[PDB]
Each structure stands twice: as structure tokens, then as C-alpha cells.
């Protein structure tokens, strides 16, 4: 199966710094960008248009770094450089609760299962965990450099015994936290440059981390070991795991590369053409996420476009 | 005198004649050069490559005579000799200057790059004219690699070669590094070829 | 005119010299990290310094630039400096000499192979 | 500029002699580092923080609890 051209989505005035989807509505797509706003999209499944935005969310005073959606497809969360987090709904905009207390920018926010609490990795070398009322119940330290990306793991069992989160900063080392005890459990060392993205597999066992040197090296936090390392030979910006089938995608500087990780080869080396842009550096994807069905992959490029790749 | 084992060995004569050190400048000729031997037609003069050997042996005796090794200074503002003097810097003390001399290095004691040698070695006296001039102010011997048209003013021991050549600058600096290392104690066998490759002393264009 | 002063240029030069495995070709993340990595008294100066570092990152990514030798640069130049060829260009590839070169060897009394070739004007 | 108002103290006095009047003007620039109030340095003076050198990890090693 080959990912091909489907359409482009023009709804921003900046780099699409985040893409997120929910299983409640397959036609929804939340997109945070550099223009201090969030654009929710509506998909129709057609030619190059692919559909229209539904709601535009405003209220952040700086670059909205990371956006995420809950399971129901209604509530949304945004991490922006204005030292605050905002909780929205896709119905009428309508920021429910702000989350202030960080002394600097916050990179990544993440919602736990059953909308229970939220974690947030910021640029003040802290991982703040917040309630939905706006109360930061816990603050976690221990990172020497400021964190670049945090994520929760998807528990395969429906809340078996506990939930855990993972952290990745510019300190070439990956932390693994259990916020039930607010304790550190695993230091993951082996990176040679600053880590800028990490992603956990939907199976809840595999962790892929990658940085400026462009290596994508794997961990299994169930066994707390390291499997291997494979490189895209250029800087990589974001990673994404397919929810249904065994693929791993990487948003590189030269373009996008999707990996079939069971026999571990490259697939097609996605290189779209942008009608010129020859003299300077070509635009590249900065944030990407697989859809709920897994047959469509959205990628946020720098030139104001969310591009969709779909298997045939 | 000499124990008669330092004479010109045949494979070193092969190295000198394959690095093209025997040919010199054109019919230009300074009378301070009696190394000229049997002027070739088309305006080429042949350097007696024998005579360069005792001068290289004598120059090697000067460098080994200095107690502290890091005070000898190798200068090459020519583009064909920065790798040679830097490689000469690695195999001995031989604190180098490659590129710009930054005048006021031998005088001007409050310079950040103030260096005082007890001996300087220069690749080309015409291009390193600042180095020989500053050595004339602060009482310093100089060793030069000379063509048959070189400005030998203020110049002590000189090794006749072609500074116009590509390979000749590298080989002569390599041979000078070989003899001073044998005398000092880094090499123990006179007949050993000093297994590090002579092609290390060569400038690269990219 | 948007010519930058030497205080901006040298502050950018020192950051490039010292923090290459760091700040990248994006101005926004460079400004957000050059504020704490360097004590700069003015926000106008901080954006000017972070701006010129990004312009230097673009210059660095396309070939080397003069006046900059950071931690991955001098190790690159010494590795290419360490070329040890096995072809032995100074060694014999088959030597060619003229008439005037040939009598030099026998006057020294050495035994070498010479293929004499005449040269005339 | 503004640092002149911040770092420089000035005084002027009239000295009366039998031939006339002398004028005394004393300007003292203090050290900006020991200011103890307000700014701590000149605006054009930046300060690059020296980093911490670190060797490569050279192998993927896992530190557990
Ligand atoms: Mg331009």
C-alpha cells in the first residue's frame, strides 16, 4: 500500500505546529499553528479541497505549540508559549479553564484517559500536572535542560493498575514518570543530541525518540531496554505511530519518511513538490499524526498547509 | 665530523628527483647560489641535489641543538606549505605560524601572539619577508628553503630547492622532520624509512 | 540601513563558537534560549543577536564560513587533514629525466633508473 | 545615553581666590558591576555563559529504578 496525494488544507497564517484527531468523529482534525490560534477542520472525503474548517479558536497571545483532543471529540487542549494552557470545546470556542503557573513557555500538553487529569511539559524544566478545575495538583522537577516533548502512554488494558507519562528534553535523556506516586522510574540514556520529539506506540510498550542528529532510536519501557537505532540522515522534527497497522512516521528536514518497522525498511520517501521554493530550503513537515482509522496521515508543513497522505 | 652514514642514500635520491626538487628557477640567478649545476635548455637550472642534503643535515643539527623543542618556529605564508609546517609542528615541538604572521610577533611583547624563538624556519623568504625582517630585530637565526632567485638577505643556513614546486615543499619539510627526529631520539634506526607516509605534508585544494 | 553592529555580531559569533549542538534555523526558539544562555540587558539587542545567529545557521548549512570554527568544524578539518594515500605519488609508477638530470646522478655516484628524454626550445 | 544618568555622578563648586574664581567639575564613573541597585551592567555588554563539556554516551544504556 502506497500513500499518495489527496489534498491540501489552507487555514492558517503560520507553521502548523500540531495536529490531533479523535476517534469520536473521523472527520474532525484539530490544528494548532504559529498564528496564536487553533483551527478545527471538517473533512468530507473528496478531491483536493477535502473540506472546510468548522471552528476557529482564539485567545492565546503567543505560538500555540501543541494541541490535543479528548476521546469524545468535544473537549480540546492547547499548549501555547504564553505560559498558559487553555481548555476548549469544538462547539462554540468558549475556553472553559485557563491553566497558569508556569514561569515560561510550555511545549506539550496531554490529556489522560477518561478526562481525569492533564500533564504539561514546559520550558522551566518542570512537568506540571493539572486538574480540570485549573488547579496544579503536582509539580515535578529533575530535568536539567528544558523539556521539549512530553506524552502519556496508552494503557492497552483499561486502567489496569496505574498510568505513566514520559518526558524528553534537550538533555539527551528520556525520563519515565509514574504520576500516581509523582516519582521517577526510568532514565533512558543514549541520545547524542537534543531530543525534540518522542512518541509512544498505541500498544503501550514501544517508545520512539528522536532528535537533532536525526536518529530514531527505540525503547520498550515494559522491559526497560533499548532495541536499535535507525537514521533518516537529516534533522527530524516529529514522529507518529499508526494506531491500526505497524508503521512509524517521521517528519524529517528533507521531507517525510514512513517506516515499516516489522522488517525495518523504508517505504516510499514522501517528497511533495511546492511549485518552486528552489533557492532556499524546501518546506518540511513539523508535526504529524495518524488518523483514527489509520488509512490517512496528516502532516503540518511550514508553508501554511496541512497535507494528507492516504493509502490506496 | 660525520660518521659517513648520513650521505645521500639512493632511495632518498629517488624521492628528491620524483618530487622534482632538482629543477630550480629560470635564468634568474643570484650569485649567493653556487648550488646551480649545468643549466638545462629552455631556461631551467638544475640544483645539485647532493648539496641540499648536507644543508638539510646541517639544518637538522641546528634544530636538535636547541634544548627546548617548542621554541623553534616554522613559518609558511605560502599556500603550498601550511600543511607541511603544521605536520612539522606535530612531530616535534616546533610552534608554528601558518597564514598571516601578525607583525609584532617577535617584537611587541604585549601581543597576544607574542612568540620569541631561538630559531625560525621559513618556506619562502620572499613571501615570509616579515618573518626574516622581525628576526633581524631580535637576534634570531633563520633557516630558509631557497630557489635560485630567492632573496637570501638576512638568511643563514639555506636548503636549495624549488619553492614553486608542489611536492618539493612537502618533501623537504618531511626530510627535515625526519632527521631532527632521528637526532633527538624518536627514531632509533638510521636505515629505517620512518614509516609515516611522506604524502602527509601536502596542501589540498578543496 | 540594517547593518548590524559589532556588539551584535560578536555576541552572535561567540554563541556559534560555543553552542552549535543547540539553537537552530528558527528565530523563535533561538530567542527563547539565547535569553537565558546569555545575560543581555535589552530585548532589542536580544532579538538582534538571536536574529543574526539564525542568519549564521543558514550560512553554516551551505558550506563553511570564515571566522567560525565550532566543535564539529575543527574535527572535520583534521580528519580530512589525516589523508594517508596508499598510491604513493612520490614513489615510482613505472624514471623520466633529462640529459642534464642524468649526469647529476653519476657525478654523485648513485645507481638509479633513468629514462632520458631530450628537451629543446 | 541613559547609563550616564545612571552611572555617573557630577558636582560643581566655585572656589574663590584673590585673583578670581576657579571652577571645579568632578565626574566619577563608578563600576557598573557593584551597582547594587537598578542595572548591573552596560546595555551593550553581553555575557555568554560558558557551557559544560560532556563526552558522548557511546552506547545505549538504561538506568532503571
Ligand atoms: Mg536572501
UniProtKB/Swiss-Prot annotation, chain A:
Family membership, please give it: Belongs to the WD repeat G protein beta family. Ribosomal protein RACK1 subfamily.
- Which GO MF terms does the UniProt record name? G-protein alpha-subunit binding; GDP-dissociation inhibitor activity; protein kinase C binding; ribosome binding; translation regulator activity
Which subcellular locations apply to this protein? Cytoplasm
Question: What are the GO BP annotations of this UniProt entry?
Answer: cytoplasmic translation; G protein-coupled receptor signaling pathway; maintenance of translational fidelity; mRNA destabilization; negative regulation of gene expression; negative regulation of glucose mediated signaling pathway; negative regulation of translation; negative regulation of translational frameshifting
Q: Which residues carry this modification: Phosphothreonine?
A: 92, 164
The misc remark on file is:
Present with 333112 molecules/cell in log phase SD medium.
Supply the alphabetized keyword list.
Acetylation, Cytoplasm, Isopeptide bond, Phosphoprotein, Repeat, Ribonucleoprotein, Ribosomal protein, Ubl conjugation, WD repeat
Q: What is this protein called?
A: Small ribosomal subunit protein RACK1
Q: What is its main location?
A: cytoplasm
List the record's Gene Ontology CC terms alphabetically. Answer: cytoplasm; cytosol; cytosolic small ribosomal subunit; nucleus
Q: Deletion: any effect?
A: Defective activation of the ribosome quality control (RQC) pathway.
InterPro entries in alphabetical order: G-protein_beta_WD-40_rep (IPR020472), RACK1-like (IPR045223), WD40/YVTN_repeat-like_dom_sf (IPR015943), WD40_repeat_CS (IPR019775), WD40_repeat_dom_sf (IPR036322), WD40_rpt (IPR001680)
Q: Which gene encodes it?
A: ASC1
Glycyl lysine isopeptide (Lys-Gly) (interchain with G-Cter in ubiquitin) cross-link, renumbered residues: 42, 49, 103, 133, 157
What are the start and end residues of each WD repeat? 11-51, 59-98, 101-141, 143-187, 190-229, 231-271, 280-312
Q: Which stretch is the leader sequence?
A: none
Check the record and name the Gene3D superfamilies matching this protein: YVTN repeat-like/Quinoprotein amine dehydrogenase
UniProtKB/Swiss-Prot annotation, chain B:
Q: Name one GO biological process term.
A: cytoplasmic translation
- GO MF annotations in UniProt: structural constituent of ribosome
Does this UniProt record's set of keywords contain rRNA processing?
A: yes
User: What is the deletion mutant like?
Assistant: Reduction in growth rate, a decrease in free 40S subunits, an increase in the amount of free 60S subunits and a decrease in polysome size.
One GO cellular component term: cytosol
Keyword list, A-Z: Acetylation, Cytoplasm, Ribonucleoprotein, Ribosomal protein, Ribosome biogenesis, rRNA processing
Q: Could you describe the post-translational modifications of this protein?
A: N-terminally acetylated by acetyltransferase NatA.
Subcellular location per UniProt equals: Cytoplasm
Q: Which residues carry this modification: N-acetylserine?
A: 1
Q: Signal peptide span per the entry?
A: none
Q: Where does this chain mainly localize?
A: cytoplasm
- More about this protein: Present with 93700 molecules/cell in log phase SD medium. There are 2 genes for uS2 in yeast.
Q: How does it assemble?
A: Component of the small ribosomal subunit (SSU). Mature yeast ribosomes consist of a small (40S) and a large (60S) subunit. The 40S small subunit contains 1 molecule of ribosomal RNA (18S rRNA) and 33 different proteins (encoded by 57 genes). The large 60S subunit contains 3 rRNA molecules (25S, 5.8S and 5S rRNA) and 46 different proteins (encoded by 81 genes).
Its family remark reads: Belongs to the universal ribosomal protein uS2 family.
**What's the protein here called?**
Small ribosomal subunit protein uS2A
> Native species of this protein?
Saccharomyces cerevisiae (strain ATCC 204508 / S288c) (Baker's yeast)
Q: What is the lineage of its organism?
A: Eukaryota, Fungi, Dikarya, Ascomycota, Saccharomycotina
State which stretch of the full-length protein is shown.
2 to 207 of 252
UniProtKB/Swiss-Prot annotation, chain C:
Its annotated function is as follows: Component of the ribosome, a large ribonucleoprotein complex responsible for the synthesis of proteins in the cell. The small ribosomal subunit (SSU) binds messenger RNAs (mRNAs) and translates the encoded message by selecting cognate aminoacyl-transfer RNA (tRNA) molecules. The large subunit (LSU) contains the ribosomal catalytic site termed the peptidyl transferase center (PTC), which catalyzes the formation of peptide bonds, thereby polymerizing the amino acids delivered by tRNAs into a polypeptide chain.
Does the record's keyword annotation contain Ribonucleoprotein?
A: yes
Family of this protein? Belongs to the eukaryotic ribosomal protein eS17 family.
**Record's protein name:** Small ribosomal subunit protein eS17B
Name the principal localization, coarsely classed.
Answer: cytoplasm
A Pfam family per the record:
Ribosomal_S17e
Write the record's keywords in alphabetical order, separated by commas: Cytoplasm, Ribonucleoprotein, Ribosomal protein
Q: Summarize the subunit comment.
A: Component of the small ribosomal subunit (SSU). Mature yeast ribosomes consist of a small (40S) and a large (60S) subunit. The 40S small subunit contains 1 molecule of ribosomal RNA (18S rRNA) and 33 different proteins (encoded by 57 genes). The large 60S subunit contains 3 rRNA molecules (25S, 5.8S and 5S rRNA) and 46 different proteins (encoded by 81 genes).
User: PANTHER family given for it?
Assistant: 40S RIBOSOMAL PROTEIN S17 (PTHR10732:SF0)
Lineage of source species: Eukaryota, Fungi, Dikarya, Ascomycota, Saccharomycotina
Curated annotation (Swiss-Prot), chain D:
Q: Where is this cross-link: Glycyl lysine isopeptide (Lys-Gly) (interchain with G-Cter in ubiquitin)?
A: 40, 52
**Where is the secretion signal located?**
none
Source organism's superkingdom? Eukaryota
Compartments reported by the entry: Cytoplasm
Cite the post-translational modification comment: Ubiquitinated at Lys-52 in response to stalled ribosomes. Ubiquitination leads to activation of the No-Go Decay (NGD) pathway and degradation of non-functional 18S rRNA: first monoubiquitinated at Lys-52 by MAG2, followed by formation of 'Lys-63'-linked polyubiquitin chains on monoubiquitin by HEL2 and RSP5.
The chain residues annotated with the modification Phosphoserine are 61
Tell me the disulfide pairings in this chain.
Answer: none
Name the reported effect of residue 52 to R: Abolishes ubiquitination by HEL2
**Beyond the main fields, what else does the record say?**
Present with 146000 molecules/cell in log phase SD medium.
So what does this one do? Component of the ribosome, a large ribonucleoprotein complex responsible for the synthesis of proteins in the cell. The small ribosomal subunit (SSU) binds messenger RNAs (mRNAs) and translates the encoded message by selecting cognate aminoacyl-transfer RNA (tRNA) molecules. The large subunit (LSU) contains the ribosomal catalytic site termed the peptidyl transferase center (PTC), which catalyzes the formation of peptide bonds, thereby polymerizing the amino acids delivered by tRNAs into a polypeptide chain.
Sequence similarity: Belongs to the universal ribosomal protein uS3 family.
What's the protein name?
Small ribosomal subunit protein uS3
Q: Which organism is it from?
A: Saccharomyces cerevisiae (strain ATCC 204508 / S288c) (Baker's yeast)
Per the record, the gene is RPS3
